[PDB]
Amino acid sequence: LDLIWLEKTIPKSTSTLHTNMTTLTTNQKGLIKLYFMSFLINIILIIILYSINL
Amino acid sequence: PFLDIQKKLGISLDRHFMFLSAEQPYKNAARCHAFEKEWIECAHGIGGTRAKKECKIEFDDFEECLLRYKTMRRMHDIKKQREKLMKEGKYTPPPHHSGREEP
Amino acid sequence: MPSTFFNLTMAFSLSLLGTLMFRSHLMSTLLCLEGMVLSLFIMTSVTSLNSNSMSSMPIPITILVFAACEAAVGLALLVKVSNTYGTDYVQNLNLLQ
Amino acid sequence: RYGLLAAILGDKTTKKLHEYSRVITVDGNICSGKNKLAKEIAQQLGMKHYPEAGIQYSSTTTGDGRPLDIEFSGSCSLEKFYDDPKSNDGNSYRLQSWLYASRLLQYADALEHLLSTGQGVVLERSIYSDFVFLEAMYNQGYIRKQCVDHYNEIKRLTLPEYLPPHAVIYIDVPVPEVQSRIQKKGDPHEMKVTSAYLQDIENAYKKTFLPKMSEMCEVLVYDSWEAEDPTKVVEDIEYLKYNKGPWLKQDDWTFHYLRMLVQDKTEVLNYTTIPVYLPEITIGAHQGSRIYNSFRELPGRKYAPGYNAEVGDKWIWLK
Amino acid sequence: KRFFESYHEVPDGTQCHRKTYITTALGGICGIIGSAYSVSLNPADSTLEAVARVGRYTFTAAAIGAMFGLTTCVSAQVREKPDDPLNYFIGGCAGGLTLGARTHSYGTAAMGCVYMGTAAALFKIGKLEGWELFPTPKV
Amino acid sequence: MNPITLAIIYFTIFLGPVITMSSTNLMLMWVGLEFSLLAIIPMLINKKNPRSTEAATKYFVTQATASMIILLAIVLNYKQLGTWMFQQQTNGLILNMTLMALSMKLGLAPFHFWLPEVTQGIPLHMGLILLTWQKIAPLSILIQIYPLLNSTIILMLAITSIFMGAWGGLNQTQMRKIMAYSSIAHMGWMLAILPYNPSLTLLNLMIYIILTAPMFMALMLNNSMTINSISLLWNKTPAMLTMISLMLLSLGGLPPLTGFLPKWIIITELMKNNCLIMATLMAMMALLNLFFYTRLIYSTSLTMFPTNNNSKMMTHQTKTKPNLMFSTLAIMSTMTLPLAPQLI
Amino acid sequence: MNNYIFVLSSLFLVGCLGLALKPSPIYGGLGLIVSGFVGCLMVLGFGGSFLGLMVFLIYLGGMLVVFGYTTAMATEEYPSNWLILGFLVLGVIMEVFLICVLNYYDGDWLMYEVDDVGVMLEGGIGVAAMYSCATWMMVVAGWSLFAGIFIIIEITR
Amino acid sequence: MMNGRPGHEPLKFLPDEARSLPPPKLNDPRLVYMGLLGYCTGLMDNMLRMRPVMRAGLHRQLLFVTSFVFAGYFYLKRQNYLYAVKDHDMFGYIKLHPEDFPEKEKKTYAEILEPFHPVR
Ligand SMILES: CCCCCCCCCCCCCCCCCC(=O)OC[C@H](COP(=O)(O)OCCN)OC(=O)CCCCCCCCCCCCCCCCC
Ligand SMILES: Nc1ncnc2c1ncn2[C@@H]1O[C@H](COP(=O)(O)OP(=O)(O)O)[C@@H](O)[C@H]1O
């Protein structure tokens, strides 16, 4: 319960949750086309966020 | 604005021409000059939060001088139904359409 | 203008969709970018003209003068790129990863 | 100080250059008599003759100028280089890396004198002619492949910024000659230099260095006999035409930035300290901290020049 | 939009069908958006491969949506308690588990259960206590 | 650079934000934005290294399309109100465009991809200008129009930025990009309070400027774009190790230092306005930012990384000094907290 | 004619559609050049002679030419315009369908209002206001051009 | 916020109305802090530039301790005004719109009956 279970649950898990989240968000091609379309997606969603909450 | 170096210096390089009722060249009055005045001498001394509810008559009108959409609408209706009356052969353009005209 | 200002506006959005999705040559973006400035110039001139707002005609042109230089800078970057990579192709622009 | 302000108001390297003002290096084998030719060429055109770069050349350069203790100067021994080749501690690579840093300081000090005074500079061997020692060392068991890569990386990062030698006077004396020349000035260490290593030095001179700088700069080679005759060699230098080379485009507004670089020694060798951790180069934190606390405590060094009272500086309370 | 809102209008634990449908849609919508960002950046190799990823993300998200909706609604009826935040936690608990499965990982199910459920529970509390999100400036 | 050109450019890079701020006719605000775009591009490619041309060509396209979108908003307004400036009546979509566009020029949230990459290919110096004297302009335009913008979007871009900035930073090891990521984050807090109390945006900016400007002139004193490079700070220049430590922990919100005030009063203002949902999540991941700040602390100060023998050579030579600004902006930044009441 | 404008507007969208599908960059040159022609005419429909000829004079042959100019000098290495034409034709028709949607629900208001008895009414008197009562737009445009000469030489070097 | 107030001085530092407020005592702890804040800046500079920390730039030390302090009096003089405007503004409104800020009667505890939770 000390060491592994109380270190894998609270202290270590929070370590992993983030580590993994940075790995996906920061693995970027660096190509402009990809990045830009993401700008496209954003414009679309924000257009909607206004639209539906008109 | 963020840094009013203009009012302070007294210069007016950017304010003289912000609205349609500003001085137009050769005093050729703009369109909707009958309203924007009425809608900005109203909202002067009254902040926006209260230039948005009580001074709504003058914007609802100025929103119609310019856009002029209610007119478009009314007229369009007149057009459509007139089509229906012509459809029932009820209506025909008066000689006004083809008649002696004023000077 | 009620529907003649919707064509121009959608022209700007169709030009918007263009600049945002690249494909090979960079020139096509720049060129597209310019398609917007034309649509903005046309719309600004159109409303100024039917509002008889002559005090504002200066703007339709200021828009073009600043847009022209803007494009000048854009093309010099483009020439700089096909001097360093022999092509304007965007894929090449992936060193900053 | 030298800066745009000074440059804006005169202080242009353009107005301070003359025919005799060039960067001339003379490179040879371990004993090419280049030391002698150098002094003379210098005496001929009044060129400031810079001595070959040394372990403590930087210490002579900075502050008091008294020679530093070996560990303060990076713990490099040319002496140990020779008696213990392929040493476990790698003193030979550390010797070479410090040597490259020393000539980087010397070349930069030379360029600063050239653009400020206007006088030319003879620098003997240069950063441009340092690689031959490493090429021969890797050809031998002296240095391993990565060690080579680390030097090449430092060379690629720092050498391109500095303008090339105008001309590169060169001497040649076949390996037998140098070995014999070694015997004349006897030194146990210098003496035990495997010929093949001397073979590799000159080779890297002839095969790679000599042609490489021949396009960018005026390479004039002089056999030993032409040498020992500074007059003739000097004559030939005064004869060559300084045309081909990157120096042609150095307008005043371009020199200013180069000057401001050499004017800043801390930058000249900024990339010489790049954090690439090859084992020989690494100070190590505990040893490095001690060497620092000890180098920084030497009189006149504990505070910036002009502010340390030990050596007799005064007016500190108003500086 | 009058649609999604409906979820809240009828008392919780009642009309689970509509709850599950609405919850499934939201998840699915998020799936599409998520896949989109996932395809725009970190693109695929072939159009089909990416269409698949859209599907994968959409379904997984739709699933987490469904089980959340279903579990919370049912947990309510069975427990005969419509405003017990725990309901939602059980639901979020389940939702995480679906995510865990679709990712084939017990561990994810762990974090998924706790983190996801907690979040959903907080939503219930939020609604119960009238917490305001993205509020207008009233200073 | 022919010193004349240097003047023209620098004047434009400086007339650019100033026209934006001073004018009220939006058009004149747009060209202020346009001049900043034109002036910055020449400096960005000064080395003209292959990385640089990439940087500028991205910065320019991202900046240009956003500039065109901002102009479209002004053009649309002109037809919904004859005025050349946003008013209470402005159609909501008109303002949202301006938020997205201006959030691209400032690089907030889902448009945060260009900044980290341009911050990576430009020099440390031009990095500062690209991060701090180019944020003043767009923010001015937003702060002026705050009464009218949407509380929902701003908050979403705010929260997103905080997260993206934090998460991005954790992985990065290049300093230029660690700073780019921090700026995204701080920029997020700033835009969170804009709808509620613009005056605090101007504090969360100045403090960011008084924190980042010393931090970068520190990175360049030794021109280290690597943490490994900044870690050998102890050998190259030992004194800056103390303040580099406090300024970076100040950039994150730790309580004794000046950096807490911006986060503290933004949280106080958001709770005053009832966003105790939003404020809480922001503060929490704000704590992620300090983790990567302290990881750098570890490498540079609390632990001494091994150095290179060739470094002893750089010690010998007199170190060109750091400008005075470093000190005055390091202290006013690391410890002004006892004087917070008058700052706000 | 009738809907003298809507038609043109439609052509403007069509041209920009082309540019959006990134036709080959010198096939895209025309795309702008031709819409630029279209927009030149449009403004000339609302009485904007000067502003209209100003574009035709500046964006048309000045900006756009120079564009293709560089378009050939650089980036002339091109291997699908037909494929583009496919989408162009379909999208064009889709554009029509969208309008057909307005047919389902929702020109007498083109020129809008004018001052019929007048002189000093012509557009183009306004643009000259850069010198009288709007002399700040003129100065900032001038600074941009002066900046451009210095900036580009610095970009090009 | 406070901008847009009637009479606002569009670009002025501290309107003369701030004359009415008391001047900041030169030894106000804050100005004294700014002084120390300054001395430290000076000392820090000496340190980063590798000079005897305290015994050097005794002229600069003065410029610093005396620049920061100078700045303080004139800043605090203003921030003090800004806060003072805030009350003028706040208190006034409480009155001009009295009904919205009504005086309340608080029943003596005798009357009020807060419930008692026993600890036991
Ligand atoms: C609010 C309180 C917050 C916490 C206050 C206490 C902690 C302050 C922050 C410390 C952060 C850095 C910690 C690690 C620093 C490591 C420094 C080091 O390793 O030593 C080398 C360094 C430089 O050496 P150098 O000065 O060049 O040597 C001269 C030789 N003749 O040696 C030096 O740099 C020496 C000079 C360091 C600067 C002086 C620090 C003294 C301690 C400051 C205490 C402030 C107390 C404030 C109390 C507030 C109460 C409200
Ligand atoms: N980069 C280097 N690496 C190793 N040894 C070097 C390097 N540069 C110079 N040396 C050594 O310095 C010694 C003295 O060179 P030099 O001054 O030419 O000899 P002399 O003074 O007899 O003419 C040579 O034996 C040579 O091996």
Please report the beta strands in chain E, taking only residues with DSSP state E, as ranges in sequence order: none
Instruction: Evaluate whether F332 touches F210 at the Cβ level (below 8 Å).
Output: yes
* Domain encompassing residue A13: 1-54
Domain tally, chain A: 1
Contacts 24+ apart (CB under 8 A), A19-25: A19/F170, A21/F167, A22/F167, A22/F168, A22/F170, A22/F171, A23/F171, A25/F164, A25/F167, A25/F168
Q: How far is CA C93 from CA C85, C88, F52, H4, in A?
A: 9, 9, 10, 48
Q: Which atom of ligand 1 lies closest to the CA of F304? A: 19
Instruction: Evaluate whether F270 touches F196 at the Cβ level (below 8 Å).
Output: yes
Interface test with F, best of A16, A19, A42, A51 (most F CBs within 10 A): A42
Distance from C-alpha of F25 to C-alpha of H62, rounded to nearest angstrom: 46
DSSP states along D176-238: HHHHHHHHHS--HHHH---HHHHHHHHHIIIIIIHHHHHHHSB--EEETTTTT-HHHHHHHHH
Residues of chain B neighbouring F14 (CB-CB closer than 8 A): none
Instruction: Evaluate whether D171 touches D28 at the Cβ level (below 8 Å).
Output: yes
Please, which residues bridge with residue D172 across strands?
A: D223
Q: How far is CA G142 from CA D25, E83, E117, F35, F39, in A?
A: 52, 68, 62, 12, 15
Provide the 3-class DSSP secondary structure of residue D49: strand
No. of H helices and E strands in chain E? 6, 0
Distance from C-alpha of F184 to C-alpha of F172, rounded to nearest angstrom: 14
Distance from C-alpha of D92 to C-alpha of D151, rounded to nearest angstrom: 13
Q: Which ligand is nearest to the CA of D307?
A: 1
Strand arrangement of the beta sheet that strand D48-49 belongs to: D23-24, D121-122, D48-49
- 10 Å Cβ neighbour count for G58? 17
> Pick from G80, G68, G77, G73: which is nearest to G22 by CA?
G80
Q: How far is CA G152 from CA C73, C75, C77, D251, F8, in A?
A: 6, 10, 9, 20, 12
Q: Which residues contact H88 (CB under 8 A, 6 or more apart)?
A: none
Cβ–Cβ gap D303/H50 under 8 Å: yes
Instruction: Give just the sign of the alpha carbon dihedral D158, D160, D164, D169.
Output: positive
Please choose from D37, D55, D78 the residue to mutate so as to test ligand 2's pocket, defined by most ligand atoms within 8 A of CB: D78
Distance from C-alpha of H10 to C-alpha of H19, rounded to nearest angstrom: 18
Interface A–F counts its CB contacts (< 8 A) at: 48
Radius of gyration of chain E, Cα coordinates, nearest whole angstrom = 16
DSSP state for residue H14 in the 8-state scheme: S
CA of H7, closest CA in chain B: separation in Å? Answer: 12
Q: Which atom of ligand 2 lies closest to the CA of D185? A: 22
CA of D319, closest CA in chain F: separation in Å? Answer: 15
What is the distance in A from the centroid of ligand 2 to the CA of F316? 23
Helix (H) / strand (E) element for F78: namely helix F50-80
- 10 Å Cβ neighbour count for H96? 8
Residues of chain C neighbouring G134 (CB-CB closer than 8 A): 55, 58
Distance from C-alpha of D164 to C-alpha of H49, rounded to nearest angstrom: 34
- Residue H24 main-chain phi, psi, to 5 deg: -65, 125
Question: Angle F321-F326-F332 (CA atoms, 0-180°, nearest 5)?
Answer: 155
Interface F–H counts its CB contacts (< 8 A) at: 47
Q: The tokens 């206001």 sit on which residue?
A: G129
Q: How far is CA F278 from CA D80, F162, F185, in A?
A: 67, 11, 15
Q: Which residues contact E75 (CB under 8 A, 6 or more apart)?
A: E86, E87, E90, E91
- 10 Å Cβ neighbour count for F261? 22
Residues of chain D neighbouring H55 (CB-CB closer than 8 A): 316-317
What is the distance in A from the centroid of ligand 1 to the CA of B102? 96
Please report the beta strands in chain B, taking only residues with DSSP state E, as ranges in sequence order: none
Q: Which atom of ligand 2 lies closest to the CA of D28? A: 18
What is the distance in A from the centroid of ligand 1 to the CA of H73? 29
Q: The tokens 């919904």 sit on which residue?
A: F80
Residue F134 Cβ < 6 Å to ligand 1 = no
Distance from C-alpha of F141 to C-alpha of B19, rounded to nearest angstrom: 19
Residues of chain B neighbouring C2 (CB-CB closer than 8 A): 69, 72
With CA atoms as reference, the chain H residue closest to F194 would be H1
Task: Find the residues whose C-beta lies inside 6 A of ligand 2.
Answer: D 30-31, 34-35, 52, 78, 81, 95-96, 99, 130, 133, 190
Provide the 3-class DSSP secondary structure of residue D282: strand
Distance from C-alpha of C60 to C-alpha of C46, rounded to nearest angstrom: 9
DSSP states along F38-70: HHHHHHHSSS--HHHHHHHHHHHHHHHHHHHHH
CA of A37, closest CA in chain E: separation in Å? Answer: 6
- Give the closest of A13, A17, A41 to E37, CB-based: A41
- Residue D313 main-chain phi, psi, to 5 deg: -75, 145
Distance from C-alpha of C46 to C-alpha of C9, rounded to nearest angstrom: 12
Q: Is D11 left (phi over 0), alpha (psi -120 to 50) or beta?
A: left
For residue H104, tell me if it sits in a domain.
no
Instruction: Evaluate whether F123 touches F46 at the Cβ level (below 8 Å).
Output: yes
* Domain encompassing residue H51: 1-97
Radius of gyration of chain H, Cα coordinates, nearest whole angstrom = 25
DSSP state for residue F228 in the 8-state scheme: H
Q: How far is CA H57 from CA B75, D307, H48, in A?
A: 84, 10, 13
- 10 Å Cβ neighbour count for D48? 16
Residue F92 Cβ < 6 Å to ligand 1 = no
Q: The tokens 């990881």 sit on which residue?
A: F295
Furthest-apart CA atoms within chain B: distance in Å: 70
- 10 Å Cβ neighbour count for D13? 22
Instruction: Evaluate whether B91 touches B82 at the Cβ level (below 8 Å).
Output: yes
With CA atoms as reference, the chain F residue closest to C10 would be F72
> Pick from F33, G26, F72, G56: which is nearest to C12 by CA?
F72
Distance from C-alpha of E96 to C-alpha of F207, rounded to nearest angstrom: 41
Q: The tokens 């918007």 sit on which residue?
A: C16
Q: What share of chain H is helix, strand, coil (3-state, %, to 5)?
A: 50, 0, 50
> Pick from F135, F158, F139: which is nearest to F270 by CA?
F158
Cβ–Cβ gap A26/F172 under 8 Å: yes
Q: Give the residue before each break in chain A, using a C-to-N cut-off of over 2.5 angstroms; say none if it is continuous.
A: none
- 10 Å Cβ neighbour count for E85? 18
Radius of gyration of chain C, Cα coordinates, nearest whole angstrom = 17
Provide the 3-class DSSP secondary structure of residue F226: strand
- 10 Å Cβ neighbour count for G34? 17
Q: Which residues contact E115 (CB under 8 A, 6 or more apart)?
A: A17, E96
Q: Which atom of ligand 1 lies closest to the CA of H50? A: 27
Instruction: Evaluate whether F175 touches F224 at the Cβ level (below 8 Å).
Output: yes
Instruction: Evaluate whether G36 touches G60 at the Cβ level (below 8 Å).
Output: yes
Q: How far is CA F52 from CA C91, F45, F56, F219, in A?
A: 15, 5, 6, 19
- 10 Å Cβ neighbour count for D191? 12
Distance from C-alpha of E12 to C-alpha of E17, rounded to nearest angstrom: 11
Helix (H) / strand (E) element for D24: namely strand D23-24
* Domain encompassing residue F226: 2-344
DSSP states along G42-79: HHTTTT-HHHHHHHIIIIIIIIIHHHHHHHHHSS----
Q: Which residues contact B92 (CB under 8 A, 6 or more apart)?
A: B86
Nearest CA to ligand 2 atom 14: D30
Interface test with F, best of A50, A51, A52 (most F CBs within 10 A): A50
DSSP states along C53-85: -GGGTHHHHHHHHHHHHHHHHHHHHHHHHHHHS
Tell me the resolution in Å: 3.3
Domain tally, chain F: 1
> Pick from H83, H112, H89: which is nearest to H14 by CA?
H83
One-letter amino acid at F97 equals M
Interface check for B14 against chain C (CB to CB < 8 A): the answer is: no
Helix (H) / strand (E) element for D23: namely strand D23-24
Class of C2-97 per CATH? mainly alpha
No. of H helices and E strands in chain H? 2, 0
Method: cryo-EM
Domain tally, chain H: 1
Instruction: Evaluate whether F249 touches F298 at the Cβ level (below 8 Å).
Output: no
- Where exactly are the structural domains of chain C? 2-97
